[PDB]
């Protein structure tokens, strides 16, 4: 049953790509002040779950949902900017830059590991196809 | 019957190698998932079990009848997973070489038989 | 592979401590002000083995 490794590692690659994309989106908007609806940008993060249907022992990984990060919104005193609060408290995203950079590095490394898994699995499948010949 | 019985040990060992590598790839995929205990199987005991009693499945979502045991963690982690990457990659490479060894042995036996049936 | 997360936690909390210190320094002229102390606590992760 080496074919299931294709599904497992492909799901892992897709999930890590989504995680890296979300981390990069958070990082690129660390300095944002406004959203499309006027709301401040809220740092977002993916949720990883075991991609196993009920009764399946072990599977790959899947992104359940994207959730707003739990952290206080960064308050900035600029009661001159057109966007402000009642007391001039501009709300800026709660992005932790170090966390996002480490997340990007971790996602890249896990991605590369899954690529190696896929490569060696394909090599083994070819061998196996050269079983008796 | 005779040929099936003679080639059954290496075939079953190679199938168990495939399932163990599927499990190890699942462990590698879930290496960054918080709250995932690494799983692995005892190859020798499960191999003897599959030989004495034929292969069986839980359902058929389907999965083998192997006992998924937990690996002892090396050092603690706040997220709560016990997938230590060094152990995972060492077991992956070892299982890779042992699967290639099984392929070599089975292919050698099958040629060792076509040679005879060759007149 | 998880020592990177320990070091990242250390760096992020160093940033937090620097933020506290900068906030304290910004109020060097604030009348009747009390400086905020800062201390790095160590949290040992309790798994089974080491």
């Amino acid at each position: 049953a080496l074919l299931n490794i294709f599904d497992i590692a492909g799901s892992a690659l897709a999930a890590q790509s989504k995680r890296l994309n979300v981390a990069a989106s958070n990082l690129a908007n660390a300095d944002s002040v406004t959203g499309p609806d006027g709301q401040p940008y809220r740092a977002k993060q993916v949720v990883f779950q075991v991609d196993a249907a009920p009764g399946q022992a072990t599977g790959g990984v899947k992104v359940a949902s994207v959730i707003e990060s739990q952290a206080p919104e960064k308050l900035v005193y600029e009661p001159g900017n057109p966007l402000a609060d009642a007391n001039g408290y501009v709300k800026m995203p709660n992005v932790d830059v170090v966390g996002e950079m480490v997340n990007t590095m971790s996602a890249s490394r896990s991605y590369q590991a899954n690529i190696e898994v896929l490569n060696t699995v394909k090599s083994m499948m070819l061998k196996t196809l050269t079983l008796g010949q | 019957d005779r040929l099936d019985a003679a080639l059954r040990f290496q075939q079953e060992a190679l199938n168990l190698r495939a399932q163990r590598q599927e499990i190890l790839a699942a462990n590698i995929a879930n290496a960054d998932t918080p709250g995932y205990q690494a799983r692995d199987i005892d190859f020798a005991s499960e191999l003897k079990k599959v030989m004495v009693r034929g292969r069986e499945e839980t359902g058929g979502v389907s999965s083998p009848a192997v006992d998924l045991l937990y690996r002892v963690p090396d050092q603690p982690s706040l997220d709560g997973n016990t997938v230590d990457m060094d152990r995972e990659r060492t077991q992956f490479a070892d299982n890779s070489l042992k699967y290639q060894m099984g392929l070599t042995v089975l292919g050698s036996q099958l040629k060792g038989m076509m040679n005879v049936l060759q007149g | 592979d998880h020592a990177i997360y320990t070091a990242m936690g250390a760096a992020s909390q160093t940033l937090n401590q620097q933020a506290v210190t900068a906030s304290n320094l910004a109020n060097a002229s604030t009348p009747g002000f009390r400086a905020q102390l800062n201390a790095l606590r160590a949290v040992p992760v309790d798994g089974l083995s080491l």
Binding site: Q45, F48, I67, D96 | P34, G35, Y36 | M8, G9
Partner: peptide, 16 residues
């Protein structure tokens, strides 16, 4: 039960 991967679940969480 999974959870948020990376920074959020590897920083010391609040007690409760």
């Amino acid at each position: 039960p999974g959870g948020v991967p990376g920074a959020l679940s590897n920083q010391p969480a609040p007690p409760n």
